């Protein structure tokens, strides 16, 4: 589990369930190439995105499809998606958790990088 | 200018208007003494809380009444009020802006501190 | 586990470890009375604060001693503590997690209330 | 006035000054076309990005170069840049303020949208 994503809903105070998440890796020609994807669980978590073998150093983008989440709940959103762009560095610790807290016109994100 | 409060609404994408804000100062007997209060303008801002002379050093609590705000908007909130507790002016006068961003089950607050 | 607290550090991207947390309940004379307390674990979590028996409806305050956390790391903080004040309502779901994300001059908090 | 960006620093309690901001607009071929760019002032604000005439409807991305900011300050950051993607002006012109609050391993962004 080198990479995990956790998504929370600030309107209802709950995990954000069945949210699509796409991860991309920056290629040498500076295009974004698909890397991993999935949908959040009942707990707002998405596990099993990648393996240690596949998750090499580089620049990654995590796109969380927030507009589809809100629209389906009957709530008008502002963003198309939430995006988190970061460099994976082997020097530091080994497990990355990208967390996002969603509101219709705002979001917060953090990374927790542990060993 | 010594103390400003600015409140935004993350559900509607707007200033949070007519929000009640109370400021307290910790007294020597460790109780919270009322200091100043006001309600936010149409821009989500509250100025005129205090003057430099009245705003002495100590421990201040800024209580923003988020629950009344969300109830007026027709939305069920979790928190009773967002609170921000800080020591002010302990190395001389500063200008403080306390900003809050509100959602029904969450808030985010920051401070900008400047030296006149 | 009706009440859990989780604290994260936005400067280092890590759990906030050994942070003191005090919980109070509003008494009938509108004073705050001590209810529970503890220190966050290596994972930034504080479990076992209360039992279902003790955690009745009412107004609660969670005080997280952030100033002591930062000062010990050699980083100058703004707040005395982070405070979260909320009503526990039996109507809604049964487990409350209060999460806080700390920075030296800012913090974010959310509640996740699940069944 | 149609597009403003405002950036704050949660480590120092200050505006984030001289932060580079790039705006892109999604083209018909689904690539991101440069639209406007600037750097934040001493108040953490960036105005003058566009005019009402130039700011047509579509999908915009506001990329705030947080990594250069933290590196200048001497602090190790996680993110490459904070990104905010949104559809603008699809029901006529609006005024958008995009605010971001930065920490080394986290950021929080909101929007205030007003109808002139
Ligand atoms: C806590 C938090 C606060 C803010 C504040 C944004 C903000 C926006 C404005 C413009 O409307 C003005 C101020 N000042 C300095 C009065 C702050 C923005 C975000 C994204 C947050 O999370
Ligand atoms: C206030 C705030 C909270 C959070 C939550 C992070 C968070 C991350 C995790 C995974 O490690 C676990 C929880 N729970 C439910 C215990 C919360 C994330 C951000 C970005 C926020 O701003």
From Swiss-Prot, chains A, C:
Not glycosylated under normal conditions. Following unfolding, caused for example by variant AMYLD1 'Gly-38', the cryptic Asn-89 site is exposed and glycosylated by STT3B-containing OST complex, leading to its degradation by the ER-associated degradation (ERAD) pathway. Sulfonation of the reactive cysteine Cys-1 enhances the stability of the native conformation of TTR, avoiding misassembly of the protein leading to amyloid formation. Changing residue 60 to H: In AMYLD1; leptomeningeal amyloidosis; vitreous amyloid in some patients. Changing residue 59 to L: In AMYLD1; amyloid cardiomyopathy. Changing residue 24 to I: In AMYLD1; Jewish 'SKO' amyloid polyneuropathy. The keyword Transport applies. Changing residue 21 to A: In AMYLD1; amyloid polyneuropathy. One of its GO terms (molecular function) is protein-containing complex binding. Changing residue 100 to T: In DTTRH; increased affinity for thyroxine. The modification Sulfocysteine is found at residue 1. One of its GO terms (cellular component) is extracellular region. This is Transthyretin. It comes from Homo sapiens (Human). The chain holds residues 30 to 144 of 147 of the full protein.
């Amino acid at each position: 589990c080198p990479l995990m994503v956790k998504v929370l809903d600030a309107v209802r105070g709950s995990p954000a369930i069945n949210v699509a998440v796409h991860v991309f890796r920056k290629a040498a020609d500076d295009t974004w190439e698909p890397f991993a994807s999935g949908k959040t669980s009942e707990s707002g978590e998405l596990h099993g995105l990648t393996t240690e073998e596949e998750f090499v150093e580089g620049i990654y983008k995590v796109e969380i499809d927030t507009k589809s989440y809100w629209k389906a709940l009957g709530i008008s959103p502002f963003h198309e998606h939430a995006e988190v762009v970061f460099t994976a560095n082997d020097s530091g610790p080994r497990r990355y958790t990208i967390a996002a807290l969603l509101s219709p016109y705002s979001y917060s994100t953090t990374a927790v990088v542990t060993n």
